[PDB]
Structure formats: C-alpha cells, structure tokens
Design an enzyme around this catalytic site. Structure first.
Site, PDB file in Angstrom:
ATOM      1  N   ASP A  89     -55.256  -7.545 -75.999  1.00 48.78           N
ATOM      2  CA  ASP A  89     -54.896  -6.263 -74.539  1.00 48.78           C
ATOM      3  C   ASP A  89     -55.616  -5.448 -75.257  1.00 48.78           C
ATOM      4  O   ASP A  89     -55.259  -3.743 -75.240  1.00 48.78           O
ATOM      5  CB  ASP A  89     -53.628  -6.339 -74.978  1.00 48.78           C
ATOM      6  N   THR A 141     -57.339   1.581 -68.690  1.00 49.64           N
ATOM      7  CA  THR A 141     -58.629   0.949 -68.835  1.00 49.64           C
ATOM      8  C   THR A 141     -59.201   1.310 -67.001  1.00 49.64           C
ATOM      9  O   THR A 141     -60.602   1.625 -68.085  1.00 49.64           O
ATOM     10  CB  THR A 141     -58.770  -0.278 -68.682  1.00 49.64           C
ATOM     11  N   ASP A 171     -44.685   3.214 -71.662  1.00 49.12           N
ATOM     12  CA  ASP A 171     -44.754   2.612 -70.085  1.00 49.12           C
ATOM     13  C   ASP A 171     -44.189   2.283 -68.882  1.00 49.12           C
ATOM     14  O   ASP A 171     -45.137   2.704 -67.301  1.00 49.12           O
ATOM     15  CB  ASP A 171     -46.501   1.588 -70.236  1.00 49.12           C
TER      16      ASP A 171
END
Lengths: 129, 72, 178, 513, 178
Positions: free
Chosen positions: D47, D81, D381
């Site tokens: 991940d 990302t 998150d």
C-alpha cells in the site's frame, strides 16, 4: 533457499560416490582379496579390508559416500557382515540398471524391479539353502 | 482496427458462444461482428487453399529434424 | 505369539474391542496398521464429510476444459482470466501420473475420455469415472480406497490456489530503501 | 556551464525514476515488496501510500520527493501519493522545456501558471458538499476508510471520526478541527469494536497496576514535584560504610515519603503525570508506590503527549512539593478512569474537566497495537479526509483521476495564455494524463490495454468525466465514493510545483563541506 | 534475480520483479511437483554438508526452504497453511499457486480495473467449490458393496501388503466401531 536439483542428475550423484566404493572393497571381498590404501595429506599409510574405514578417515561426500557408510553401518548393525558386500552391490546396481532403464524412461518399473530381483533371490536362496 | 487482439478475440470467442455465423473482428469496420454481413467478402475457395497450405505447409520440415546440405 | 493381553470381556459401561494384529514380527503389524490408519482415516474422513471427492485430478481435469471453455463463456479478459486457472486443472495430473511415469498426457487422454460435453457431471454417480487413483497413475474404480480425500480438504486449497495470486497484488508504489 | 544542466537533469532524472517507480497505486497492482535494503535488510512493504514516507532515497531531488511525500500527507491525510505521482509529471515537461529554448525561469512560472490555472479548474470539478454534514463527514471517512486499513471497522471509525470532528468542529470552509486538537490515543486491549470515542480528555499513561482509581473525585496529574525526604532532598549525616548504617538511610527514606503521598492525595489528587526529568530521582520508586498506596495514578517519565494535551484540555501546570503543597495549577479533573478490559492496557480517562471547546480524545483499541493501528491511522485519515472536508468542503474525483480532466482543460489554457509558458503549460497539460494509465503499471503481461484509454476515457468524455481509477467502470470520475475534498488535489499540485521549481534554480556544483 | 540488480529488495523495476517472482513461483513449485504425494519422489534435502533429510512432503521442504521472493514467500506458507488446514495440499496448492499469481497480475495490470480479474481465479475455484462439494461421486467409504467392510477392504486393499482387506476388511470396521 531457492534451488532445484534434478532426478537422474541427483541419481547420478547417488551413482558417483557409491560407484567408487563399489570397487576396491569388492576386490577386498572374498577369497580373492585386496587392501584399500589411504594417502594421508601428510603421507601416512592406511590400508584396510573396509573402505568405510577408509572413508571415515578421509573426505566423505554428501552423496552415497555418506549413505554407503550409513546403509553398511545398517548392514554392520544387523548381521555384522556384508558391509563390504553392500557397498559393492548398491552403487553397482544403481550404476547398472538406471541408465538402461531411465533411457526407457522409468524409475517406476525399476521401483518394482529391485524387490522382484530380490524375490527370486530370497526365494530360490532359501530353497537351495 | 485499433483493438486489443485478445479481449476482442476472447469477445469474438464469447461472440461465437453467442453468435458464430459470420462474427469476427473486422478492421474493415474496426468492429467485432458478422464479417460477410459487414461486407467482408472473399470466396470460400481460398480458405481450403490456405488451409491446405496452413497445416500442411508446417508439417513439411517438422517431418525433418535432420537436414543435410551439400556444396555441390 | 508370546504376547499377552488382559482381555476384559463384556465391558458393561460401553462396548469395546482390542484387535490383535498377527504378524510373524511386530513390524508386520505396522504395515497393516499404516494400511489401517489411513483406511481408518479415510473412512474417518468419510466420517468427516458425506460429500467426498476423488483422489487425483480427474476432478480437476474435468472442470479444466469445462471451465476453460467457461473462459470463452464470459469471454473478454475473463476468457483470459478463467482459462488461466482452468487451463491449470490440467497440470496437476500432468504431475500426478508422471510421478508414476505414466506420461499424464496419456492420463488426460483417459481423464478427458471421461470428461465430456455429455459428461460434465460430478453428479453423485459415474457416467464418467471421476476417480483417479494415485497408487497407480491411472483411474481405478475404487471409491473406498485410502488415497482419496474428503471435500473438506479441497475447497480449502481452492482458496490457497487463488491465494498466491491476489495476495501479492494489493501493494502500491514500488520503491527502494537505503 | 555543464555542471548546472547535468545535475539539474539528474534532479529531473533521479527523482523522476523514483517518481516513476511510484505509481502502482490504488489497490491490487504489482507484486509485494519484501525489500532487501541498500544495506541488505529485508523488509515487506505494501500500500505504497505509506511506503512513500517509508521509502529511503538519496540524491538531492530524489530525497526531496520523500520530503515532498509528506507534503500531501502533512496537511491533508488523504491520497498521500497525489503529490508524488505528479512529482514526475512536472519533470515530464522539465527536460523538454529546458531543451525547448525555454528558460528555467520561463519554466519556473510555467509550473506556477500551470499550478494557478490547474487548481482553478479543479474548483469547477470540486462539488461543494456540506462541511458539517454527517454524510460528507461519514462518507469522506468511509471512502477513505474504504481505501484505508479497515473497511469493516470503518462503520465504527467513520462516525467516531465524525463524532470526533463534530465535537471539535469549528464549522467552516477554512481551517478548522486541527490535528493538535483531536487527541488520538491508543489502548492495548478492548477491540476496535471497543475503540471508544471519548468526548472528554483521555490521557494515555503507564499506570501502576490496579487497586487504583477508576472512580470519581480526582485532582488531575501533570506534576513535576519530587518528594523531599531524608536521603532524598534532605540532609542525612548518617554515614554509609557498614551495612547497618547503610540500612539506616533507606528506612528513614522509605518511612517518611508515605506521609508525602498522603499529602498528595490530600490535594485531591488521584492522578500524577510525573515529569520525565529528575529533581534528584524526582519521585523515587519508594515515592511512586506510596503514591499507589494512596490510589494516585502515577507515571514517572510521562510522555510529552499527555503533558501538552492536559495543558491544552484540562489546563494543567506542575504543582510544588507536597510539603509545600500545591498552587492547584493542576487543572480540574473529576473521573479518573483506568479502563481494564481483560486488564489489558493502562488508560487514564478524565471524564469532565476544563476543556478548550475542543480535543476529543478518542481511545483506539484492539487485541494489539497492530489491530489498534488498523483503526488509528484509519480513523486519523478518516478524521483527516473529514478534516480535509472541514478544511475544504467538497468532494472531487479521487485517486488522481481529475488531473486527466485537468489535463485536457489546461491544454485549452495552453492556448488562452498564448505565452511562452503556454507551451510549457501545454507540455505539462498533457503530462497529467500519465497517472491513471501509469497507476496500472507494475502487475503483469500484455500491458497496453490500459494506457491511451485512461487518457481518452476523460478525453472521450469531453471535459466532463471518465472512468474512476479507484473504482472502475465508465462513470463520472468526480462522483463515485471515491471522493476527496478539493484540498487534497490542489495541495498536491501546489506542493510539487515548488520543490520541482527549485530544480530549475538548481545549478552548478555547490556542496556544504 | 533479473532486471536492474543495483536496487535490491523486490524492486526489479517492473515485471522483472513480477517475472522473477513467477519464475521463482514456478521454480519454488518445481520442488513440490516431483514431490507430489507418494508417487512424488522423496527428496533428499541437504540441510548442510553434514545435515540432510528425506521427504516428499510439500510443506516439509518449504518450511526448511528460505524464500526472499514475495511469490516464493506466499508459496511456502500456502504449502504450510494448507498443511495447517489439513495436510492435504502440502503438495497440492504449490503447483498452480506458481501459475495463478503468474495468471493473476497479468490481466490485473491490463485493468479496465483490477477488480475484474480477481474473481476469475476465485470464480472457477468457486465453480470448483460447488463441483468439489458436488462430489459424493468418488471417495465415498460409507457407500460400498460391503459398506464399511469394503471401505476397510478397498482402503486396506489400496495399501495392501497382504491379506489386508480379508480379515482387515473387518478390522477398520471393528476398530472404528470399538
């Protein structure tokens, strides 16, 4: 780790070290006899009627050089004879049958073969005993 | 046709588990569908011709793994 | 035999039997007992499950071309997807009978002789023999032999078969660590 | 000279391949990394959203991207990302534009002009959704939590994330519900099922054993005071040579302190968070267990976390030696609760206290910290993407998908600028089509089916929509429930714009010795 | 491995670390194939120049094997965890487990979206799950000609050394029912 060794080549590795042991102590066997000389790296004389004695005193290979001691020690534990005979039969027969048979492509009917050539062997032996 | 072969080819296979009359991938239309009804039209004679070649053109030398040549 | 056992006859809390294996030597009993345990176990494995599957890949090599044609059924990338596994139900017998040196391409010849459009059929019966007896390398009509395995042990491996596949996928961002 | 170009090219080169090796992203792609390091250490990583930070890279621009990897993670906490995947999307145009007769300066504002216009269009594809809405919180958490560790405990975490934010929510389309605010604490034991949202401040300390207060009436901890005793702060002229006189010193030392801890319980204190410093030994192990004789929850060497949050929430300051007693700078506490669920974990729960209208303290539990961190980073998150929706109220296309929408439309602004950088924009306006096809990168055989489509999939969808990158199937990229607030993507572009624009000014050869 | 060798740690940068895993998967599966079952030949496993062991078991070798490949990693545990399941599938999972991770990621990468290909290796297994559970067809010991007695016999007559299946057609019945 990750490594793969194969069959007849491993069988040959089983053939090789044994095939050497199958010789001298076969000559050392029986009324026509010999001695197996062992060169020490310093030069010391060693000769016996047992090649496994020579093997214990020199390099022994992980192939049947290890096993032809083992199974002869197995032969040494039981009747206390034929250790000289076992080393010289096994590697021989493994040097004899396999190539002729594996080119016909089988350990399989060879799997049955040894106990079949054992069968009459054991059979007519006791009968002519 | 701009297509991926295989999925399209696999579709056509499924399309030949569904259809299978003329169905095929036609750069003619850049589609996948009946060819003869897509106006993909050539005589069936050349098929046998090519297929008389196809399987047999391969079987010649595979009948020979020992091939001799000479300077003369 | 020069071997004594204390026989308790008509045990009244519950029935019992102690079966004395006659060998001329004691290791003759193990050859029996090894034959016994797995016989005990396979029956106990049929005591594990009613539904029970044949040993050998005639179970697999059947669905193989069944489901590799089911690849085509959905077609598209799934004809790729479904075939990749269903081409592989061919390979286990290709290992099986070849371990017996039967050249399993001869076995899959015999396997898919059973495996038909007319016989797609696990059924509970055999209009195709789905057994592959792995003490041989070719099917034998034994369904009671000790080589076969229950349905418990298999559907497990079906996860395990697919388990090496997608377990390794979920990663993102291949990197380097100093 | 040649010195600027090469290393600047290398800045565009070494960092690009790192940024190029990045995109496997969004789910089942590639194969796992069991990583023999550059030192040989073997490490398993999956991940890559987290692996970005975990990745160890040298070289000036290449290590810059790991430092740029947190850039999306630091403020947002969603789609980490997004900046690293576009870290090479700018390096795309970099080479060409340096080679195009376009100056690194003209390339510098090029990033800006592309950044300026990029985040502009992203607002159009940002669908504003209510900042305090339970759903736009829950579903933002959910969608994230769906991508984050736990997809089941999401249904626990998402409302707890909502309930943690909605407690600290300062409803706005601007900065609110900070990370310093929400206090996320971990407790061994319980379950993620037993992960408990706690409105009140919960300090996570090491509490000595039990037989201590789970109950009410506690004056709060965070005390720095040592207990003055003979052989502690007090002079003893008793000399230690013989064992008996060496024995006489500890007994007066041990017998006296138990009165001190009574004075500490006399303060009303059932809890002491003891300074990690030592005034001499500060509180000795004599003093600490005497504190435990008074049912006073006591941690010597307390974490810095419960030092500041007890200042932030309960409003607590150290109090003096208990012979000197206290200034009562210890904040207001009432319930001092150590939860023992199967006895696992030492958890100080203050239910009711001084509070700054903020700092929900959510206890994150599980059979192990691994199970805990399944929730914690997820709820964080989840809080974050909620915080992001509290930061920016909207949900956009998730997983880099909208950049391809931004790709085509920035190519239009490539014409509208009509400048030298309009070409620069143009080169990069087509360099945002890279990610979705590239996210597919690493897995397997017969590749190309993914590539130009994901390009075209928005292109064919005009300026409206394309397939989702994280979900799949032809739809709107924007409305999926793969959704992130506009912040995440406008963050990423803003972040990579600068650090990569530094490359343009990276020149010659200069190294601090 | 294969590909760039200067970044260690399962970054071969691209399918080089996919293929080096599938060719290792195939390689790590090469161990168990000729080991498969009893027909699979006993391997003589060198543990050291002075340490060996002889096993054909699929899960015995791989517990001894080191695997630093991710696909070689998932294969050892699959031999082991399916052994942990039963012991049927020490060997069984290994063969196709080399294939399916080689079969999975290929189309997964092709993605219309990777979720599609995942079931392809589950679906046929699911379709094998039914088929496998659809099997009473072979392995049923409870349904014999002699029932348990032949369930004894045929399972004894599989491992038969002798009159196993004669008096031993009785015993496996006698043993389980004692």
């Amino acid at each position: 780790n990750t490594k793969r060794e194969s069959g007849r080549k491993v069988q040959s590795g089983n053939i090789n070290a044994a095939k050497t042991i199958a010789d001298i102590i076969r000559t050392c066997l029986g009324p026509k006899s010999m001695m197996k000389m062992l060169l020490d790296p310093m030069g010391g004389i060693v000769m016996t009627n047992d090649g496994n004695a020579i093997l214990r005193e020199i390099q022994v290979q992980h192939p049947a050089a290890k096993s032809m001691i083992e199974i002869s020690r197995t032969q040494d534990e039981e009747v206390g004879d034929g250790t000289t005979s076992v080393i010289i039969l096994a590697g021989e027969m493994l040097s004899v049958a396999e190539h002729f048979l594996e080119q016909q492509m089988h350990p399989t009917v060879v799997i049955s073969a040894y106990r079949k050539a054992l069968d009459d062997m054991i059979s007519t032996l006791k009968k002519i005993s | 046709a701009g297509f991926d072969a295989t999925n399209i080819l696999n579709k056509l296979r499924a399309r030949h588990a569904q259809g299978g009359t003329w169905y095929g991938v036609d750069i003619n239309n850049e589609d996948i569908a009946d060819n003869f009804e897509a106006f993909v039209w050539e005589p069936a004679m050349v098929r046998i011709n090519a297929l008389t070649a196809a399987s047999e053109a391969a079987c010649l030398i595979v009948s020979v793994d020992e091939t001799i040549k000479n300077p003369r | 035999c020069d071997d004594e056992l204390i026989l308790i006859k008509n045990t009244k809390a519950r029935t019992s039997a102690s079966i004395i294996l006659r060998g001329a030597n004691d290791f003759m009993c193990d050859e029996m007992e090894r034959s016994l345990h797995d016989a005990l176990c396979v029956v106990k494995r049929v005591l594990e499950s009613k539904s029970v599957v044949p040993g050998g890949g005639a179970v697999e090599a059947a669905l193989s071309i069944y489901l590799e044609n089911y690849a085509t059924s959905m077609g598209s990338r799934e004809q790729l997807a479904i075939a990749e596994f269903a081409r592989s139900l061919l390979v286990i017998p290709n290992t099986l009978a070849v371990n017996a040196a039967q050249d399993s391409t001869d076995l899959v010849a015999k396997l898919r002789a059973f495996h038909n459009e007319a016989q797609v059929n696990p059924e509970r019966k055999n209009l195709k023999w789905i057994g592959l007896d792995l003490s041989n390398g070719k099917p034998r009509d034994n369904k009671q032999a000790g080589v076969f395995e229950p349905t418990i042990v298999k559907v497990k491996s079906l996860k395990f078969a697919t388990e090496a596949a997608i377990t390794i996928l979920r990663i993102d961002d291949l990197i380097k660590l100093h | 000279r040649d010195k600027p170009a090469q290393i600047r090219f290398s800045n565009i080169s070494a960092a690009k391949a790192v940024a190029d090796a990045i995109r496997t992203s969004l789910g089942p792609k590639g194969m796992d990394k069991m990583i023999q390091d550059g030192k040989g250490d073997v490490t398993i990583t999956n991940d890559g959203a987290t692996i970005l930070k975990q990745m160890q890279v040298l070289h000036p621009a290449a290590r810059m991207l790991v430092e740029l990897s947190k850039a999306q993670d630091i403020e947002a906490g969603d789609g980490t990302t997004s900046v690293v995947i576009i870290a090479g999307s700018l390096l795309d145009s970099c080479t060409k534009l340096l080679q195009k007769g376009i100056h690194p300066t003209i390339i510098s504002e090029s990033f800006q002009k592309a950044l300026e216009k990029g985040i502009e269009i992203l607002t159009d594809m940002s669908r504003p959704v209510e900042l305090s809405d339970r759903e736009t919180l829950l579903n933002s958490a959910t969608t994230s939590l769906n991508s984050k560790v736990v997809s089941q405990y999401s249904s626990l975490l998402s409302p707890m994330s909502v309930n943690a934010v909605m407690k600290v929510i300062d409803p706005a389309t601007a900065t609110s519900v900070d990370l310093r605010d929400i206090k996320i604490v971990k407790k061994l034991g319980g379950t993620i099922d037993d992960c408990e949202l706690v409105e009140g401040l919960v300090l996570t300390q090491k509490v000595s054993n039990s037989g201590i207060t789970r109950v009410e009436k506690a004056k709060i901890g965070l005390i720095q005071f040592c207990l003055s005793a003979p052989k502690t702060d007090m002079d003893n002229q008793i000399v230690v040579s013989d064992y008996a006189q060496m024995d006489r010193v500890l007994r007066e030392e041990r017998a006296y302190i138990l009165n001190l801890v009574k004075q500490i319980k006399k303060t009303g204190c059932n809890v002491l968070l003891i300074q990690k410093s030592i005034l001499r030994d500060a509180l000795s192990d004599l003093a600490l267990h005497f504190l435990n004789k008074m049912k006073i929850m006591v941690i010597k060497d307390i974490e810095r976390e419960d030092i500041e949050f007890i200042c932030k929430t309960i409003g607590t300051k150290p109090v003096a030696h208990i012979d000197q007693f206290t200034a009562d700078m210890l904040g207001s506490a009432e319930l001092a609760e150590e939860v023992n669920l199967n006895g696992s974990g030492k958890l100080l729960k203050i239910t009711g206290c001084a509070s700054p209208g903020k700092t929900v303290t959510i206890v994150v539990r599980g059979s192990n910290k691994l199970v805990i961190e399944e929730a914690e980073r997820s709820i964080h998150d989840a809080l974050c993407v909620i915080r992001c929706l509290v930061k920016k109220r909207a949900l956009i296309a998730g997983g880099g998908a909208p950049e391809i929408e931004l790709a085509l439309r920035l190519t239009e602004y490539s014409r509208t600028l009509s400048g030298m950088e309009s070409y620069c924009v143009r080169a990069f306006a087509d360099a945002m089509e890279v990610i979705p096809s590239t996210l597919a990168e690493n897995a397997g055989l017969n590749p190309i089916s993914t590539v130009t489509e994901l390009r075209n999939r928005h292109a064919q969808g005009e300026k409206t929509a394309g397939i989702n990158v994280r979900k799949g199937g032809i739809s709107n990229i924007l409305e999926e429930l793969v959704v992130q607030p506009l912040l995440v993507s406008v963050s990423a572009l803003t972040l990579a714009t600068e650090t990569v624009r530094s490359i343009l000014k990276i020149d010659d050869v200069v190294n601090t010795r | 491995m294969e590909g760039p060798l200067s970044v260690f740690g399962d970054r071969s940068t691209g399918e080089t670390i996919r293929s080096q895993n599938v060719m290792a998967a195939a390689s790590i599966a090469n161990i168990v194939k000729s080991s498969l079952g009893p027909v699979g030949l006993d391997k003589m496993l060198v543990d050291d120049i002075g340490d060996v062991t002889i096993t054909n078991d699929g899960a015995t070798i791989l517990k001894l094997l080191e695997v630093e490949h991710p696909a070689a990693k998932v294969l050892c545990e699959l031999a082991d965890l399916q052994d942990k399941e039963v012991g049927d599938g020490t060997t069984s999972v290994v063969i196709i487990a080399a294939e399916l991770l080689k079969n999975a990621d290929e189309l997964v990468k092709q993605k219309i979206h990777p979720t599609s290909v995942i079931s392809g290796y589950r679906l046929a297994c699911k379709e094998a799950v039914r088929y496998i559970n659809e099997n009473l067809i072979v392995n049923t010991d409870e349904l014999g000609r002699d029932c348990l007695i032949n369930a004894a016999k045929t399972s004894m007559s599989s491992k038969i050394i002798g009159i196993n299946g004669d008096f031993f057609a009785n015993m496996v019945v006698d043993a389980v029912l004692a």
